[PDB]
Amino acid sequence: DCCIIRVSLDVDNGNMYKSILVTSQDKAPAVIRKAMDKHNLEEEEPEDYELLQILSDDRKLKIPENANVFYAMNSTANYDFVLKKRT
């Protein structure tokens, strides 16, 4: 099992930055961390920054900890995720 997802930043620019391959075993709060980790923000906590799915300029879904990636991700339109600072 695997899924291909895209990650983009609020902090610098979006559209496409890097892609992460996720399995069903690795959970969304860990991916929250992994994707920001992968953007080198290993030292910062999700307590400040958090991750959002972007489809196409309207329905944009914030991705929290209790949601499974495999379920919270859409596949249907665009699989982009943006990490945003909420502080």
- From CA 32, how far away is CA 68, in angstroms rounded? 11
> How many residues does this entry show for the chain?
87
Task: Look up the CATH number of the domain holding residue 66.
Answer: 3.10.20.90
Q: Which domain holds residue 47?
A: 1-87
Number of domains comprising the chain: 1
Picking from 64, 53, 70, 65, the residue whose alpha carbon sits closest to that of residue 1 is: 70
Chain breaks in the chain (C to N over 2.5 A) after: none
CB-count exposure of residue 56 (10 Å: 0-12, 13-18, 19+): exposed
Structure tokens at 63: 């991705």
> Are 66 and 50 contacting, i.e. CB atoms less than 8 angstroms apart?
no
Q: What is the largest CA-CA distance in the chain?
A: 35
> Are 36 and 83 contacting, i.e. CB atoms less than 8 angstroms apart?
yes
H or E stretch covering 16:
none
